[PDB]
Design an enzyme around this catalytic site. Structure first.
Site, mmCIF file in Angstrom:
data_model
loop_
_atom_site.group_PDB
_atom_site.id
_atom_site.type_symbol
_atom_site.label_atom_id
_atom_site.label_comp_id
_atom_site.label_asym_id
_atom_site.label_seq_id
_atom_site.Cartn_x
_atom_site.Cartn_y
_atom_site.Cartn_z
ATOM 1 N N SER A 1 0.806 -1.215 0.000
ATOM 2 C CA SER A 1 0.000 0.000 0.000
ATOM 3 C C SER A 1 0.842 1.270 0.000
ATOM 4 O O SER A 1 0.279 2.365 0.081
ATOM 5 C CB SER A 1 -0.938 0.009 1.209
ATOM 6 N N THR A 2 2.167 1.153 -0.079
ATOM 7 C CA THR A 2 3.023 2.332 -0.034
ATOM 8 C C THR A 2 2.900 3.179 -1.295
ATOM 9 O O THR A 2 3.175 4.383 -1.251
ATOM 10 C CB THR A 2 4.476 1.899 0.179
#
EC number: 3.4.16.4
Lengths: 85, 543, 87, 348, 132
Positions: free
Chosen positions: B277-278
């Protein structure tokens, strides 16, 4: 032309002796440069030795402990900081 | 008169004999033709300094003892005497010498203190001499071991900057002439052919204060979380310098006895991982650069178990139905990112991801610096688009992830990395328009500050701006991943009002407390920016 | 007048070796300036490492001057002090 | 005058000047202080040699026919003084020089020119008997005896060779010439009977020039770049100056010097031939003698340098160091330019 | 004949001039008001010129230097007429002096009566210790 030939020949002789003198002079300057670079190398050797001896005592953790213990130094608080522009 | 002729002929015959002899000797026997020796004087390496003034790698004089075995055949009765001063069996030392008797130059002991040098040479055995060989020493120790690397016994770079900058640090040697003998001993130092070139001092951009700091609280994080390994990268956003960078577990460069190579493993450059999710901020950047999406558009993510073909895009939280883009980042909604990627298409996503630098290479040049892989396809399979949207099915190392987040913090003006110190202001490519960059910085600020996100990552007295993440580590052999083996990730920048410092914190396999990025790496994130922002001397913006 | 060509060639070669080659006076000035700058940096480096040995001499016996490094590297302050920052 | 001969001899002279300047700098700097010691003194020797050549050009030839007796008287005086102590310094095993200040004088060369002059003055009289056979020997046997009692063997060798050859031109027998040659050889061998590697020592020169020639190359390594002359050879500007020239100018310069020596020497012998055709027997004979003296010195120097012959510390004409040798060479030059002048008197 | 300039005192023994060569005159106790200067044995070349330049640079500040000291380490310590000691530090003397002048002109205008010491040994600013 004969006098011109004589002048050109003596000028050539002067140029040749100047070349010999200059090559010897360059050899001498190279010797002097090696001398000074050896001096610089031993000076940096002493500097490296001193740095090696110092680094075992000026370590970050040791200096942190020293500052917090002996002189009772504390990490600054951003709440009390005089920001000046 | 014929006497004229005979005398002239005899003179010409003698002259011809002379010239024949000289032309025979000069050229024919030139290869065949103890008197003079042409020797090379070594040069010393350069100085590796931090950003301002602190040396990081220095060359120190060490007395090294060598011998000329040609002079040492006269020591058949003395090799047992000399072996005691060395620490090896007398018969073994004799065998070692005799197998290389033809050799002219042999090293006996290296790395020995001068005093023991005089102690050993006190035996006055012929052929043994002492030289002031320079040994590389690292003041910072294991702190900057991976970021500087080390040289070998031959004083040649092997890892890190040492291997990367051999041509800059190790100067070219010089040439000298000597008057040697049959035994190789020099009578007189003859004119130097060419003098050595001193090594040039290379000033790294790493700041040793921030490096010490980050190393301290990162080992603190490992001991507090009981994880296998971790790493951290500091980046200036205006110049792209790596202001600090560390990996754990570390190794002591000055004591290399049995260091297993995973201690040598510079995970900030060799370890590849899916960002997870970065990479949501880059997806939002693409969405707002296209102009179709707006920051205030409500997206439905119910039930959080969206189905795509034969694949299931599971979402961590299924308790929220409607979520804005900021809510998407906060909750790390896989369904929301999947829907927005479907709406926008993965083409622009891959465009912005290559523009920022993810999965690409930078002008750093380190041994083993991996490249990552961001797949490029002429078409766009739906599952591929989803995986590109929410991070999986991809590999990016921490260094270029930090570069991308610095570009985000630098108004989209991506700057190439420069671990060496930078003297002039660089001019990069405007990857992201200023409006999109400012909006993304705003959403990141609300992600770190607003409730339900990462409270642990808030930096006191500073507007943080970061995003968490978690990577399901890849397992070799079994196609996929390995169970209960997750990497915690966090990245961001501060201050959110005007960024000047970026960060990426990676911790590998925390199996004691948890695997959430905001649970593990967030406190470390906050601590490292507290210290680094204090040291970088920027004004605080909260009170 | 044949021999003039050889003399011209020899003088040209000699002047080339006197102005271009390793024996040139240009190289004389080059090495003189190099040695001058080299000696300058010798004296500067001797002053530098002399200061270094003096400070390491103080370090092993004293503590009042380790505060310099403790507050430069860390920015630490004592309890009764106030940081005036300029930025 | 004589443009080609003068050009060749001045080429030899200037090349010797540059060679001594290039080869003596190291030894002059080390054991004399200023690096320009041998070269600066060689320049002064060169200029006084030119002045002496002019003076010999300004003094008539018949003076050598009549005033030679005092010339050999002073030659005998100098040859006595070179052996007596007090007014002579012993250097390198021999007390060859006599010093009057800054001008060390070697009497071997003035003795050589005087003995050549008197041989010619005798041979113009008795070219065509045993009394003549014995008479010419008393002219040179004392010379050889004195110069071999002194440690000087190259001078006696060139004396014998020059004398034999310059008798061979101007009347030669079938077997009696060989007889006088063999008796001279027997005398010198008897004198030898009376008085009969090493790179770490002072014998470095035996293989130094050999390896130097081995590394010389076709074109050479330029002016003043030899690595076998910086303290490797003391007085290299005298004995091995040709080896230094070889290292400094390659095969090209080495052969140029050898061929130009040959040119000037054969020009000397050939102007002697002209003087013979010009009915100037005295001038012809002195020219033959001087030319063969020069070729003998040149050949022995090149032979010892190349290694074909044992060590002979003898100078090279117009190239090696030494005031006396160069001054006598310039005087011989003036004599030859005169021979040209008297031959041209009827031509111009 | 050049006349020495009694402008500085080396410890309590010697007198220094603009160049600062060690000279001692007939009477020593006469110069009570003259500033006190200290340094290593090999320091009669730089302490006097640094004092002169610092005085010239801080003259608009209204500060008259009382004592100047140099440890062999090279760290400079300065004391003024008002009785407050200043630890300028090892290096970057002119940069630190400019920084301190700016900080004094900005946020230390009238605060000149409650300072124990002023520590310039910071890369960004300074620390002020206060006295009751």
């Amino acid at each position: 032309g004969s006098f011109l030939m004589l002048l050109l020949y003596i000028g050539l002789l002067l140029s040749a002796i100047a070349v010999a003198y200059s090559t010897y002079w360059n050899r001498q300057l190279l010797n002097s440069l090696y001398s000074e670079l050896s001096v610089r190398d031993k000076a940096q050797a002493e500097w490296g030795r001193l740095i090696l001896e110092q680094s075992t005592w000026t370590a970050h953790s040791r200096i942190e402990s020293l500052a917090v213990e002996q002189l009772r130094m504390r990490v600054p608080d951003p709440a009390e900081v005089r920001m000046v522009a | 008169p014929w006497r004229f002729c005979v005398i002239v002929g005899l003179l010409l015959a003698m002259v011809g004999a002379i010239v024949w002899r000289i032309v025979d000797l000069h050229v024919i026997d030139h290869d065949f033709l103890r008197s003079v020796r042409h020797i090379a004087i070594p040069a010393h390496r350069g100085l590796i300094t931090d950003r301002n003034g602190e040396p990081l790698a220095v060359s120190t004089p060490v007395t090294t003892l060598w011998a000329n075995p040609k002079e040492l055949m006269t020591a058949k009765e003395r090799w047992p005497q000399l072996a005691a001063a060395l620490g090896q069996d007398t018969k073994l030392f004799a065998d070692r010498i005799e197998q290389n008797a033809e050799r002219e130059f042999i090293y006996l002991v290296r790395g020995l203190t001068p005093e023991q040098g005089e102690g050993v040479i006190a035996l006055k055995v012929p052929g043994v001499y002492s030289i002031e060989e320079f040994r590389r020493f690292y003041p910072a120790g294991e702190v900057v071991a991976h970021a500087v690397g080390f040289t070998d016994v031959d004083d040649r770079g092997r890892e890190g900057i040492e291997l990367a900058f051999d041509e800059w640090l190790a100067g070219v040697p010089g040439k000298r002439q000597v008057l040697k003998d049959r035994r190789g001993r020099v009578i007189k130092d003859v004119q130097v052919t060419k003098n050595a070139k001193p090594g040039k001092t290379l000033a790294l951009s790493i700041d040793l204060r921030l490096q010490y700091l980050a190393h301290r609280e990162l080992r603190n994080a490992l001991l507090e979380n009981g994880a296998k390994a971790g790493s951290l990268v500091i980046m200036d956003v205006k110049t792209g310098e790596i202001l600090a960078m560390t990996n754990q577990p570390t190794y002591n460069p000055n004591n290399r006895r049995n260091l297993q190579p995973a201690a040598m493993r510079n995970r900030a450059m060799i370890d590849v991982f899916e960002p997870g999710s970065t990479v949501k901020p880059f997806s939002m950047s693409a969405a707002l650069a296209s102009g179709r999406w707006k920051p205030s558009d409500i997206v439905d993510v119910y039930p959080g178990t969206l189905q795509i073909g034969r694949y299931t895009i599971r979402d961590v939280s299924r308790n929220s139905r409607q979520l804005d883009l900021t809510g998407i980042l906060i909750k790390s909604s896989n369904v929301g990112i999947s829907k927005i990627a479907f709406d926008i298409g993965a083409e622009s996503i891959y465009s912005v991801m290559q523009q920022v630098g993810l999965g690409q290479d930078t002008g750093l040049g380190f041994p083993g610096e991996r490249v990552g892989n961001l797949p490029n396809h002429r078409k766009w399979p739906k599952a591929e688009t989803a995986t590109l949207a929410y991070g999986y099915g991809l590999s990016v190392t921490a260094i270029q992830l930090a570069h991308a987040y610095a570009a985000l913090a630098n108004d989209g003006k991506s700057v190439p990395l420069s671990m060496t110190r930078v003297d002039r202001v660089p001019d990069g490519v405007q990857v992201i328009s200023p409006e999109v960059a400012s909006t993304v910085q705003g959403m990141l600020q609300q992600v770190v500050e607003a409730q339900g996100g990462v409270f642990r990552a808030q930096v006191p007295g500073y507007h943080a701006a970061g995003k968490s993440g978690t990577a399901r580590k890849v397992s070799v052999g079994t196609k996929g991943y390995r169970e209960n083996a997750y990497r915690s990730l966090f990245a961001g920048f501060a201050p959110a009002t005007d960024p000047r410092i970026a960060m990426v914190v990676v911790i590998d396999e925390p199996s004691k407390a948890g695997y959430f990025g905001g649970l593990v790496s967030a406190p470390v994130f906050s601590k490292v920016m507290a210290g680094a922002l204090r040291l970088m001397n920027v004004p605080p913006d909260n009170l | 007048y044949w021999l003039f060509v050889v003399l011209i060639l020899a003088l040209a070669g000699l002047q080339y070796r006197l102005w271009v080659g390793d024996g040139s006076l240009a190289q004389v000035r080059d090495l003189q300036k190099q040695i001058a700058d080299q000696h300058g940096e010798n004296e500067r480096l001797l002053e530098r490492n002399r200061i270094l040995e003096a400070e390491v001499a103080e370090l092993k016996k004293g503590t009042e001057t380790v505060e310099e490094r403790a507050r430069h590297e860390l920015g630490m302050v004592k309890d009764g002090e106030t940081l005036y920052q300029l930025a | 005058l004589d443009f080609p001969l003068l050009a060749g001899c001045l080429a030899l002279l200037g090349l010797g000047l540059v060679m001594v300047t290039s080869a003596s700098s190291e030894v002059a700097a080390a054991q004399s202080g200023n690096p320009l010691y041998f070269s600066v003194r060689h320049l002064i020797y060169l200029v006084i040699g030119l002045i002496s050549c002019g003076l010999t050009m300004m003094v008539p030839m018949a003076t050598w026919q009549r005033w030679g007796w005092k010339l050999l008287l002073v030659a005998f005086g100098l040859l006595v003084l070179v052996i007596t102590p007090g007014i002579g310094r012993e250097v390198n095993g021999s007390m060859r020089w006599i010093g009057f200040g800054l001008f060390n004088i070697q009497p071997s060369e003035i003795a050589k020119v005087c003995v050549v002059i008197f041989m010619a003055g005798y041979l113009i009289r008795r070219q065509q008997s045993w009394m003549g056979f014995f008479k010419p020997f008393v002219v040179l046997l004392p010379m050889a005896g004195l110069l071999l009692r002194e440690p000087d063997f190259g001078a006696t060798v060139v004396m014998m060779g020059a004398a034999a050859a310059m008798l061979f031109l101007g009347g030669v027998g079938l077997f009696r010439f060989g007889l006088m040659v063999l008796l001279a050889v027997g005398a010198v061998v008897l004198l030898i009977q009376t008085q009969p590697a090493d790179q770490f020592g002072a014998g470095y020169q035996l293989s130094q020039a050999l390896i130097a020639f081995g590394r010389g190359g076709w074109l050479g390594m330029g002016l003043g770049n030899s690595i076998q002359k910086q303290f490797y050879l003391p007085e290299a500007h005298t004995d091995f100056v040709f080896a230094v020239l070889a290292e400094e100018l390659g095969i090209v310069g080495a052969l140029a010097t050898v061929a130009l020596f040959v040119f000037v020497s054969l020009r000397a012998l050939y102007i002697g031939i002209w003087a013979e055709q010009a009915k100037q027997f005295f001038s012809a004979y002195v020219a033959y003698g001087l030319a063969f003296l020069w070729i003998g010195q040149f050949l022995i120097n090149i032979g010892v340098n190349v290694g074909l012959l044992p060590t002979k510390g003898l100078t090279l004409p117009f190239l090696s160091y030494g005031g006396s040798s160069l001054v006598i060479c310039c005087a011989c030059l003036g004599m030859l330019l005169r021979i040209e002048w008297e031959r041209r008197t009827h031509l111009g | 004949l050049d006349e020495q300039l009694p402008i500085a005192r080396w410890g309590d023994e010697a007198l220094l001039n603009n160049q600062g060569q060690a000279f001692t005159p007939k009477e020593l106790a006469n110069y009570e008001h003259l500033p006190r200067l200290h340094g290593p044995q090999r320091a009669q070349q730089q302490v006097m010129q640094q004092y002169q330049l610092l005085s010239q640079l801080l003259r608009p500040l209204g500060f008259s230097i009382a004592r100047l000291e140099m440890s062999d380490r090279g760290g400079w310590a300065l004391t003024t007429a008002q009785g407050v000691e200043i630890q300028i530090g090892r290096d970057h003397v002119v940069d630190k002096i400019r920084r301190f002048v700016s900080i004094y002109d900005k946020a230390l205008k009238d605060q000149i009566s409650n300072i124990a010491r002023i520590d310039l040994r910071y890369p960004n600013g300074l620390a002020v210790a206060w006295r009751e």
